Design a protein around this ligand. Structure first.
Ligand SMILES: COc1ccc2c(c1)N(C(=O)OC(C)C)[C@@H](CSC)C(=S)N2
Lengths: 430, 556
């Protein structure tokens, strides 16, 4: 059904033409799946095949977001966002409720399908062009352009903002002590009431939503060992830590002292004014390694006083919204990895430790991808912005396997680290 | 004959206007030869004389090829191409013969001048305008304008393909099984029907096309069964590139080596083992195509080694999905590795090579995995599938590696295989400090300007030593110091460094580097029983560091 509803004119920043992005080659199953999807969406009037007159493009992918049964077509709108929305980050930008982070418990749920009923500006549709890749270039690429609002796109929820707000009010009214943020096809809901009360409160919103429109928060189900049931349930009541942790026992031999000093010297670049000198003095004598040398007098002053500056970090806690967040993860012990988000080096806004149970699927890539995904949500909730990721993985590698374990609707910007840092410790930061 | 098919809408790059080039006349026999074609091209409707209105010019070249019998012209729309909007990428890559299916009969149709049958958008025609003055320029109104897709123009290919895609659709469905492919002026049709049932269908396609407006004057299959598609030699069950000949000179240039490296690179597809390692290593100098680069004995021993291979024909088999895919890789040394992908053993599907260039000294394993990747990648690009890996690596050496390395990876389904060039980690730097072993506090440095360095050490039991070095770098010194430390030590040793850089390379565990020093160090590492490496800061560091550098400094 072609809706006679009026659309909002989408014009980007001049001096910036549409995305002409290369479509990554996909697996056979993945292609057929996209074809399936699109063919039905084409009937539905949502998308439309175009001609050569449309030179623009966007990457498409195939995900298994639900619980890994059906395929979700994921669109890499990263460029278009840049290309339009960074000027629609102001024009009709959704503001961030700075306490959502201070909140006790939050939940995330797909609200992507919502935008599908609503139509997309005629003179702009061209920019949504994507291509389904033919295997081995056998046949010409399959080209469609969106006619309605795009899922991945950041401009979509911006337009639907008006509609969404309205469709929220009844719940918002009867339920005041609940925050609701809309970053993309996801709605973040926060509460200070406990689990039981909260889940029933979520089901309420789900019901409410579903009542007030075919806006369908996709089905609740279980998975991992201690069985879950509905939505991605975060808990920012504990979103802070000090992963530093110095050796509370191993400070007896020369090497232990030697190694110690170096980490401390790196810490100097972050926490200013760390006294290492008095401690590094009882080393100078070129003494043998493994020699159990007991710690001196003035040397102990350099530890205990700077071991408490490690448990109380304050300086430029500031966050520049004019600048972007940069999160870099580094591979640590088998199951664990460690992330660090900063906007200007050493000035670390958030520092955490990820760790998936070593046994379930001891896969290297899964782990990272999983990390990034989480690391990202952590950002939105706290800042409403996706970080550029400095990835310790081969470009080509990632570009192959990421889409495999990608259960998210969004895709953050990324980069790849081709350099080994001394930064990796027993418990490391940046 | 003009095709009725719907023409796509074309505009000029925003705020731009079309070409206006009132060309310099030529009263030559060429000017008559022009109208000979035109006032016979308009008869076929390809072009049309337009009125003295606004239509602005585009230069006509009345030329003809070396005695081509049929004097044919051509308008060069160089400036028009500049003005016209952007279209979709036509040459989005070509299909690779490596992943095609076995076809009983294949046909190829000539779609040249079919561009000339497909029509051009009406609100655009005016831009392809051109005039041509004859005798005494007193008859300028010989102004024509294109109605179809102009040869050489920008839209021409992207539109044509689209129109053809459009056109073939009803036909592709009245008989789904038969597949068609198209590119430029070629039409590679193919199916598994008996020759007669097959050859009839072709004439059917031909009439269909001819029913729109396109033409195939070639009575049947005119292109000989062996095909030269993009150089490749195509036959019903095998593929290669028959013309694969590279001449032997004696005093060649960069210009000529580039073509060599390229023709050799081309051959890497089916011909197994081709190495362009030393062959390209030399081109690295600042480009000037006309500069002669004298060959090395290595570069000589590589070409002839390749010539050996390239002298004899070897073909490639086709893809059959029903069968699983498998790829095998093996090391050739000096960074060179080679792969082959097959289904039926020794039924070579395709081959290729990887080499870690420029970025020197790296682990053998990282290479193997970097290799797998290219393959993994290239497989999806072709078969949309990832292959089974047959590779010379002990499962335990891999386990330990990813469990050791910093960067993340994932090698899919793989299995072991034996071949003398086996990949393994020869040594491992000790995790914890060795107890009984001597502690070599080490330091190295150089006067960057003078290039004269001094490398050396000091030990827990005052075993000092400092050795001079000239025409070396500050880093070369840093490594020299370790090698030294290794030499003068026993079987197990503990070595400490001031340079973070120094540390890296050793931890990286490379092998067979062209760097003479690194090899020496490697060998020492392999010879050793245990080696604990430690790192402490360069300047403000003590632990002996507050003496080892005061020991290796002299000059400025
Ligand atoms: C001797 O020529 C061939 C032998 C085997 C194949 C082809 C040609 N193929 C093709 O696209 O033509 C060119 C671009 C290679 C198609 C059948 S033609 C549709 C396939 S699936 N295998």
């Amino acid at each position: 059904p072609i809706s006679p509803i009026e659309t909002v004119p989408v014009k980007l920043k001049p001096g910036m033409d549409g995305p002409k992005v290369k479509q990554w080659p996909l697996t056979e199953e993945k292609i057929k799946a996209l074809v399936e999807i699109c063919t039905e969406m084409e009937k539905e009037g949502k998308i439309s095949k175009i001609g050569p007159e449309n030179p623009y493009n966007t990457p498409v992918f195939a995900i298994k977001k639900k619980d890994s049964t059906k395929w979700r077509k994921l669109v890499d709108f990263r460029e278009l966002n840049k290309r339009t929305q960074d000027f629609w980050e102001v024009q009709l930008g959704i503001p961030h409720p700075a306490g959502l982070k201070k909140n006790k418990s939050v939940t995330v749920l797909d609200v992507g399908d919502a935008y599908f009923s609503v139509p997309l500006d005629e003179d702009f549709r061209k920019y949504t062009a994507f291509t389904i890749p033919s295997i081995n270039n056998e046949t010409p690429g399959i080209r469609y352009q969106y006619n309605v609002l795009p899922q991945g796109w950041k401009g979509s929820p911006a337009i639907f903002q008006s509609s969404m707000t309205k469709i929220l009010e009844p719940f918002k009214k009867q339920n005041p002590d609940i925050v609701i943020y809309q970053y993309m096809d996801d709605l973040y809901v926060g509460s200070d009431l406990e689990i039981g009360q909260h889940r029933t409160k979520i089901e309420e919103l789900r019901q409410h939503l579903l009542r007030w429109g075919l806006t369908t928060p996709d089905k609740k189900h279980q998975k991992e060992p201690p069985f879950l049931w509905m939505g991605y349930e975060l808990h920012p009541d504990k979103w802070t830590v000090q992963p530093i942790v110095l050796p509370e026992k191993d400070s007896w031999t020369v090497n232990d002292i030697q190694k110690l000093v170096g980490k401390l010297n790196w810490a100097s670049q972050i926490y200013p004014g760390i006294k290492v000198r008095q401690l590094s003095k009882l080393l100078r004598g070129t003494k043998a390694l493994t020699e159990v040398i007991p710690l001196t007098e003035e040397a102990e002053l350099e530890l205990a006083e700077n071991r408490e500056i490690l448990k109380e970090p304050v300086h430029g806690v500031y966050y520049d919204p004019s600048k972007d967040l940069i999160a870099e993860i580094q591979k640590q012990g088998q199951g664990q990895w460690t992330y660090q988000i900063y906007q200007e080096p050493f000035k670390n806004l958030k520092t955490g430790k990820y760790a998936r149970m070593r046994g379930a699927h001891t896969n290297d890539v899964k782990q990272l991808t999983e990390a990034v995904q989480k690391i990202t949500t952590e950002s939105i909730v706290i800042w409403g912005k996706t970080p550029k990721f400095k990835l310790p993985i081969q470009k080509e590698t990632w570009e192959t396997w990421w889409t495999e374990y990608w259960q998210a609707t969004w895709i953050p910007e990324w980069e790849f680290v081709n350099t080994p840092p001394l930064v990796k410790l027993w418990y490391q930061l940046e | 004959p003009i095709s009725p098919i719907e023409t796509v809408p074309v505009k000029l790059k925003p705020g731009m206007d079309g070409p206006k080039v009132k060309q310099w006349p030529l009263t030559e026999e060429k000017i008559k030869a022009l109208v000979e074609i035109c006032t016979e091209m308009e008869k076929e409707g390809k072009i049309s004389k337009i009125g003295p209105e606004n239509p602005y010019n585009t230069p006509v070249f009345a030329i003809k090829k070396k005695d081509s019998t049929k004097w044919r012209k051509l308008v060069d729309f160089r400036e028009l191409n500049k003005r016209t909007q952007d279209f979709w990428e036509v040459q989005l890559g070509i299909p690779h013969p490596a992943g095609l299916k076995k076809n009983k009969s294949v046909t190829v149709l000539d779609v040249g001048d079919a561009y000339f049958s497909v029509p051009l958008d009406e609100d655009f025609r005016k831009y392809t305008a051109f005039t041509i003055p004859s005798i005494n320029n007193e008859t300028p109104g010989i102004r024509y304008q294109y109605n179809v897709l102009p040869q050489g123009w920008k839209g021409s290919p992207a539109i044509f393909q689209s129109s053809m895609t459009k056109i073939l659709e009803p036909f592709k469905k009245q008989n789904p099984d038969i597949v068609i492919y198209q590119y430029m002026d070629d039409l590679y049709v193919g199916s598994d029907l008996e020759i007669g049932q097959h050859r009839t269908k072709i004439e059917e396609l031909r009439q269909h096309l001819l029913r729109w407006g396109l033409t195939t004057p070639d009575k049947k299959h005119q292109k000989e069964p062996p095909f030269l598609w993009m150089g490749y030699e195509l036959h019903p069950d095998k593929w290669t590139v028959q013309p694969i000949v590279l001449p032997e000179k004696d005093s060649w240039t960069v210009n000529d080596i580039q073509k060599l490296v390229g023709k050799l690179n081309w051959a890497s597809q089916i011909y197994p083992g081709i190495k362009v390692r030393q062959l390209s290593k030399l081109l690295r100098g600042t480009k000037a195509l006309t500069e002669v680069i004298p060959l090395t004995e290595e570069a000589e021993l590589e070409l002839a080694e390749n010539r050996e291979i390239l002298k004899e024909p070897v073909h490639g088999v086709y893809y059959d999905p029903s069968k699983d895919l498998i790829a095998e890789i093996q090391k050739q040394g000096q960074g060179q590795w080679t792969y082959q992908i097959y289904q039926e053993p020794f039924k070579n599907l395709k081959t290729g090579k990887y080499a870690r260039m420029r970025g020197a000294h790296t682990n053998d394993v990282k290479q193997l995995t970097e290799a797998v990747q290219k393959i993994t990648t290239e497989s999806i690009v072709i078969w949309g599938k990832t292959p089974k890996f047959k590779l010379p690596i002990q499962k335990e050496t891999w386990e330990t590696w990813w469990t050791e390395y910093w960067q993340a990876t994932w090698i899919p389904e793989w299995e072991f295989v034996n071949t003398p060039p086996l990949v393994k980690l020869w040594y491992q730097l000790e995790k914890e400090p060795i107890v009984g072993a001597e502690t070599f506090y080490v330091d190295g440095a150089a006067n960057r300007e003078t290039k004269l360095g001094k490398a050396g050490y000091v030990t827990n039991k005052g075993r000092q030593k400092v050795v001079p070095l000239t025409n070396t770098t500050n880093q070369k010194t840093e490594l020299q110091a370790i090698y030294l430390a290794l030499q003068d030590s026993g079987l197990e040793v503990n070595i400490v460094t001031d340079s973070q850089y120094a540390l890296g390379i050793i931890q990286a565990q490379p092998d067979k580097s062209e760097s003479e020093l690194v090899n020496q160090i490697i060998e020492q590492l392999i010879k050793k029983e245990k080696v604990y490496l430690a790192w402490v800061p360069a300047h403000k560091g003590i632990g002996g560091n507050e003496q080892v550098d005061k020991l290796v400094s002299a000059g400025i």
